[PDB]
Structure formats: structure tokens, C-alpha cells
Design an enzyme around this catalytic site. Structure first.
Site, mmCIF file in Angstrom:
data_model
loop_
_atom_site.group_PDB
_atom_site.id
_atom_site.type_symbol
_atom_site.label_atom_id
_atom_site.label_comp_id
_atom_site.label_asym_id
_atom_site.label_seq_id
_atom_site.Cartn_x
_atom_site.Cartn_y
_atom_site.Cartn_z
ATOM 1 N N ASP A 184 0.975 45.329 -74.021
ATOM 2 C CA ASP A 184 0.730 46.108 -75.485
ATOM 3 C C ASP A 184 0.570 47.631 -74.990
ATOM 4 O O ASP A 184 -0.436 47.968 -74.437
ATOM 5 C CB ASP A 184 -0.598 45.817 -76.496
ATOM 6 C CG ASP A 184 -0.507 44.565 -77.134
ATOM 7 O OD1 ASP A 184 0.359 43.627 -77.252
ATOM 8 O OD2 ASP A 184 -1.611 44.331 -77.693
ATOM 9 N N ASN A 229 -5.885 37.637 -94.310
ATOM 10 C CA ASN A 229 -6.709 38.654 -94.923
ATOM 11 C C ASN A 229 -6.241 38.574 -96.637
ATOM 12 O O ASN A 229 -5.133 37.712 -97.029
ATOM 13 C CB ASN A 229 -6.399 40.337 -94.628
ATOM 14 C CG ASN A 229 -5.019 40.867 -94.975
ATOM 15 O OD1 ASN A 229 -4.455 40.598 -96.043
ATOM 16 N ND2 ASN A 229 -4.425 41.367 -94.125
ATOM 17 N N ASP A 259 -7.383 38.785 -84.440
ATOM 18 C CA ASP A 259 -7.664 37.726 -83.450
ATOM 19 C C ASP A 259 -8.987 37.498 -82.858
ATOM 20 O O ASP A 259 -9.359 36.295 -82.469
ATOM 21 C CB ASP A 259 -6.637 37.791 -82.527
ATOM 22 C CG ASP A 259 -5.073 38.033 -82.918
ATOM 23 O OD1 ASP A 259 -4.793 37.117 -83.744
ATOM 24 O OD2 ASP A 259 -4.585 38.897 -82.698
HETATM 25 C C1 HO4 Z 1 5.173 43.257 -84.472
HETATM 26 C C2 HO4 Z 1 3.827 42.554 -83.966
HETATM 27 C C3 HO4 Z 1 3.536 41.780 -82.980
HETATM 28 C C4 HO4 Z 1 2.256 42.316 -82.312
HETATM 29 N N1 HO4 Z 1 1.847 41.165 -81.783
HETATM 30 C C5 HO4 Z 1 0.808 40.964 -80.912
HETATM 31 O O1 HO4 Z 1 -0.492 41.095 -81.934
HETATM 32 C C6 HO4 Z 1 -1.303 41.216 -81.006
HETATM 33 C C7 HO4 Z 1 -2.544 41.842 -81.850
HETATM 34 O O2 HO4 Z 1 -2.876 40.903 -82.996
HETATM 35 C C8 HO4 Z 1 -1.156 42.608 -80.248
HETATM 36 O O3 HO4 Z 1 -1.310 42.293 -78.653
HETATM 37 C C9 HO4 Z 1 0.672 42.261 -79.995
HETATM 38 O O4 HO4 Z 1 0.796 41.982 -78.683
HETATM 39 C C10 HO4 Z 1 2.679 39.941 -82.142
HETATM 40 N N2 HO4 Z 1 2.638 38.591 -81.561
HETATM 41 C C11 HO4 Z 1 3.500 37.793 -82.004
HETATM 42 N N3 HO4 Z 1 4.740 38.206 -82.867
HETATM 43 C C12 HO4 Z 1 4.588 39.592 -83.122
HETATM 44 N N4 HO4 Z 1 5.626 40.030 -83.822
HETATM 45 C C13 HO4 Z 1 3.743 40.334 -82.644
#
Ligand code: HO4
Ligand code: HO4
Lengths: 321, 321
Positions: A12, A195, A254
Site C-alpha cells: 500500500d 458501515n 479492518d
Molecule cells: C481499491 C481498493 C482496495 C484496497 N484494498 C486494501 O484495503 C486495505 C484497507 O482496508 C488496504 O491495505 C488495501 O490494500 C483492497 N483489497 C481488495 N480489493 C480492493 N479493491 C482493495
């Protein structure tokens, strides 16, 4: 005790625009856009939904196996998790594709602007959760974390075929999925996380009443930002829980769901386990990045007690003791 | 012969959203934005304005020293350039800060969405071009490539204090700078590069007539996308030159300015050197990324000739021979 975090693994990369996005959006030609921001900071942080969670459950002290697809750059990450007690044996290492990447720019206000490269995440459709049950046996909970779409169904389909408790967590794919698909992720859910904005959205797209949703799941949870969260059973018990007082963005969601479910999966009550969610959400929101935060028995104590009572605190810390 | 490319050095991380940006912009709340795109490809490519150019001049066969600030991750990049004939002795390696980074997402249409982390680029204000003149002597041209703002002035100020030919190339900072500042980058310019949209913009912000601009510089160049470019001297000669026919985005602009100025700085005429710009622009636009393109005497020939004449071709290839 044992929850397996099924979801996404990412790196990230996050930046910060010290001005405001609007002020470039406002005059721009929004059909043939040429947007550019001057950022003043850039971090790389271990991320992914299933990995922010695994780390949460593990640091909190509980049993968690990580089920998500990934690339070959993933040795530093793996040893990172396995060192705190995460069981990474069940991650699928790709032959052709790099670990997924999440790029986000955030501004003073702070609107979000972001891209998502899935990389090896799409192969999470090729994993059977059976081969997991084989390796460590039938977990208390499979969490269906935001992931590759087809995986997410398959991992929900397979739980139901194996009598496994799952926790719908579809945050990201509500936007992107139908009513039909969305409902095919929420049937028999032992948990459902969202949410309230999303839960409205959910209700529109699925066409269900709040009621028959509640027929089919066993417990809707619904986080309300600076308000709190509403845990709510089909028998209307609607225990409400406020937040530890903030005073970051990514990860938090998360992180609630990690402390909640670890606090749950150490025998704590809906409320206490919700109070524990609120602690770990805010541990993030106060930490450089998502997963460079420290678990501390002392700290938590003398702080769980400020927001809830001294009655409140002791118990959670007992059970995490 | 010897041109020193003063400008930016970056790594450039590029993605592609196979849908369309508009279709998320259109409904979004543009004061508190929550934008996210699902990309299907991701590349990392050596970039930076002064480095796309250096590489161009060098691969084309001419003498170029790279003057730009940078980090410690910059050994792979340096040896990359120095291997083709770029003289990287004058790059400033930072003690505290990573090589600048350019992140861009492009869609089907293809609007641009981007962030810029400057990193060590801001230290390019601490470099004296004297210490260059010392090392290799007084170059034919210092190009003031898009860079750190204060550097860009200083490197324009210092050229004028040392009787050095410079080539204003302020593309990126017109948007971000005043009328005053902009004009303080365009006084005595031996060259001035811009697209026409920017050159309009330039005229508004600076408050100058096309005329007295032309008093102060010696040659405005102005690229017109699928049209071409207009090279134009104070004595009105206005030689026009179309494009080699396209059939990428980033880099192209710097790639015209590379072939043009190398084609110039091998004695070619305004037109021929402009025809050579048009060849290298399109070599990029047809290459995986900016600087993984191949110079070929044969190819160029049998292709310079399709767009311009066989008269046209031979000469450029003679001089690059
Ligand atoms: C677009 C968005 C995404 C961010 N994330 C992850 O969400 C985390 C925070 O809740 C971040 O670390 C990102 O890698 C995703 N994971 C699976 N599919 C996704 N599309 C995403
Ligand atoms: C924003 C933009 C930037 C992209 N670039 C570089 O432009 C090259 C293409 O012309 C890209 O490689 C990018 O690194 C910049 N260089 C100096 N300052 C900048 N602000 C930028």
C-alpha cells in the site's frame, strides 16, 4: 479460537497532498481529465485486507491462518506475519504476477483518490478451503474479506458446503456488484459487517427488507464513524457502543473487525468484543501506518477505562491475558 | 555538440484503467472525493524530464551531461545512462531523500490522473552550474527542464551570469507559476519550448505580446499535437513541420525536444532538426515505455522518407552518421 482471514494481500503506497483536491477538480474538464497533484510525503506499508486483519488477530494474541493469493515478492511479508503468530502456510504464491498494489493519495480534508492493481489476487479463485481444513482442520470462522470477486463467492460457497461459520465483509464490492451477487454473499453469514451508508446502499441494491436480511444472517454489525457501531441480532437486541476518542484513514475498518472478532473469538460478549474493536481501530488511526502499531496490556487497560468503565476494561484485558 | 540537460530525474510508475474516468467523476461528490480505479496493468520505468532527454540526446549519438538532483537508489539508473553516452558525474546524490516519483493513471480516452513526489529534486537549488563548467567546460546549451522551481530560476539566472545558451522548457510550471516568474524564465532564452495551449496560457499570465516575447528570446518552438510544430524566429520565418504518422503518452514532449536539439546540435537546420524531433517523439509513442526504445540508422531512414522526402531523410541520417 481459530479464524482464517480470507481476503486480499497488498502492498500500500500512500501519499499526501498538503493542498486540497477540490481546488483542482473544480475548474478541470471532467470528461478528458488531466489531473496532477504535488505530494509532500510517500510511504510504502504492508497492506491488504486479509493481511491487516491477520496481523490484528495475531498481535491481539489469537489463532489466525492467512488465506489469500500473492506473488513472489512475498517472502519479506510472509516472514513478517509468521513472526507474530500468523499461519501463512495457506497463501498461494503466484507464478506469473506480482503482489497486488494499492495506491492512494489523500489531502487535507481528506478525500481519497486511488488505484488498485490486483496482480496475483485474481488467482484466489483457484484455492480450495478444503485443503485448509485438511491442514489445520475446520476453523471457527472463515472471514470473506474484500478480495477477488469470484474467489469471494467461491469462498462463501465453500463455507456453506462445509458447515463453516463465515463473516461477510463485502465493503469494497458493494459498489461494484449487483443485488443478486451481493445477496449471494450474505446468506447464512454468521456475521455481516458494513458501515451504514453501505448498508443503505446494500438495501437498495439487494431489494431486501432489513427484516429478511436478518432472517438469513445471525448478526448485522454497522459502524458509524465518529458515532460508533450497532450490533444487532435478529431478536432486536441492539447493543450500541461508542468509540475511543480519536484526537491516518486506511486500515481502521479492518482493524475494528479484527479486535472485534478476536475479542469475540476469545469468549467475550458482543459489547466487550465491540469495545475491543474500538480500541484497535484507534490504535491504527494513531500509528504511522496500518501495521506498525504496538499491542500493550498496560496501555490498553488505562485507556479502555477512560472511554468505557473500569468494569469494562479488566475483562477484555483478562481474556487477552 | 555539448548540451547539459538541467531538469528532473524520476522513476515513473504507470497504470492503466481499462474503463473511463469520467464515469466515476460524473456522479462523485467533488469536494470530499472518494475516487478509486481498478487498473489492469502496472509498469515501473525510468523517467524524469532531464533523464528522458539525456537518454534521447545520447542514444541519438551526441554529447550530454546530466544535471539533476537524485537519491541513493540511483546507481541502477546512473549506470543505465552512463552506458549509453550520458555523463552523470554532475548528478547530486541526496543524503536524506529518495529519487522523485511520478505516479500516473491513464484510461481508455485517455485522461490523466497523477501525483508527484519530489524527493531529492528540491536540492537541485544547491547545485552550481559553475562546478560543471569547471569539470567539462562551458556547454553549447543548458536546457532548463521542468525541475524544482527555485533550481529552475537559479539555473536560468546562472546561465545568464556565465553567457550560456539556454532553452526554456517550462511546460509543467506554467500552471503553477506567476506572470513575473514565468518571464524570469524567458529572458534571453536561445530557445523556448511549449505547446500552443500552454503558449496561450503563457501569454495571458505574463501579459506580454507575442512580439516582445520574441524580442527577448531567439526562437519560439510550439508543438501542435497531431498537427506538428511551428518554429519561428523573430524575423518571422515560420517554418512548419508535420508529424511522422502515429498509428503511450508520457515522454513524447521531451522526446521531440531531444531529437530536435541533438539534430540541431549536430549542425542541422531548423526544419531538418524539427523533422528529427518528430521521429524520436514517435519512437517513444511506439515503445513499451519512454526509454526502452531503439535507435536504428536503417529504420529511421526508411521512415523519415515516408513522412518527409528522400531528400529530407539522407541528411539527418548523414549527420547522425
Ligand atoms: C481499491 C481498493 C482496495 C484496497 N484494498 C486494501 O484495503 C486495505 C484497507 O482496508 C488496504 O491495505 C488495501 O490494500 C483492497 N483489497 C481488495 N480489493 C480492493 N479493491 C482493495
Ligand atoms: C507532476 C509531473 C511531473 C512529471 N515529471 C516527469 O515528466 C516526465 C515526462 O515528461 C515523467 O517521466 C515525469 O517523471 C516531472 N518532472 C518534474 N516536475 C514534475 N512535477 C514532474
Amino acid at each position: 479460537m481459530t479464524i482464517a482471514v480470507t481476503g486480499s494481500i497488498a502492498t500500500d503506497h500512500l501519499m499526501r497532498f498538503p493542498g486540497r483536491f477540490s481546488e483542482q477538480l473544480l475548474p478541470e474538464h471532467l470528461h478528458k481529465v488531466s489531473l496532477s497533484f504535488l505530494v509532500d510525503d510517500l510511504v510504502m506499508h504492508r497492506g491488504g485486507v486479509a493481511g491487516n486483519m491477520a496481523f490484528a488477530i495475531g498481535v491481539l494474541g489469537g489463532e489466525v491462518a492467512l488465506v489469500g493469493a500473492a506473488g513472489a515478492d512475498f517472502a519479506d511479508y510472509r516472514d513478517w506475519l509468521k513472526a507474530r503468530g500468523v499461519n501463512c502456510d495457506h497463501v498461494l504464491i503466484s507464478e506469473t504476477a506480482h503482489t497486488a498494489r494499492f495506491t492512494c493519495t489523500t489531502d487535507v480534508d481528506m478525500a481519497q483518490l486511488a488505484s488498485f492493481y490486483p496482480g496475483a489476487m485474481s488467482e484466489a479463485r483457484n484455492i480450495k478451503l478444503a485443503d485448509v481444513v485438511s491442514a489445520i482442520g475446520k476453523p471457527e470462522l472463515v472471514i470473506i474479506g474484500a478480495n477477488d470477486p469470484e474467489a469471494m463467492f467461491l469462498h462463501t460457497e465453500e463455507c456453506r458446503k462445509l458447515g463453516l461459520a463465515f463473516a461477510a465483509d463485502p465493503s469494497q464490492q458493494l459498489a461494484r456488484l449487483s443485488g443478486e451477487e451481493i445477496r449471494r454473499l450474505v446468506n447464512g453469514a454468521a456475521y455481516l459487517f458494513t458501515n451504514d451508508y453501505e448498508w443503505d446502499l446494500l438495501l437498495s441494491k439487494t431489494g431486501w427488507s432489513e427484516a429478511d436480511v436478518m432472517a438469513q444472517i445471525d448478526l448485522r454489525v454497522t459502524t458509524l464513524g465518529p458515532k460508533g457501531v450497532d450490533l444487532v441480532e435478529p431478536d432486536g437486541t441492539t447493543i450500541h457502543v461508542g468509540v475511543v476518542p480519536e484526537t491516518d484513514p486506511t486500515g481502521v475498518g479492518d482493524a475494528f473487525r479484527a479486535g472485534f472478532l478476536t475479542g469475540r473469538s476469545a469468549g467475550l460478549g458482543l459489547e466487550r468484543s465491540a469495545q475491543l474493536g474500538s480500541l484497535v481501530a484507534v490504535l491504527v488511526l494513531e500509528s504511522t501506518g496500518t501495521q506498525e502499531w504496538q499491542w500493550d496490556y498496560e496501555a490498553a487497560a488505562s485507556r479502555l477505562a477512560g472511554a468505557y468503565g473500569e468494569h469494562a476494561a479488566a475483562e477484555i484485558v483478562a481474556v487477552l491475558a
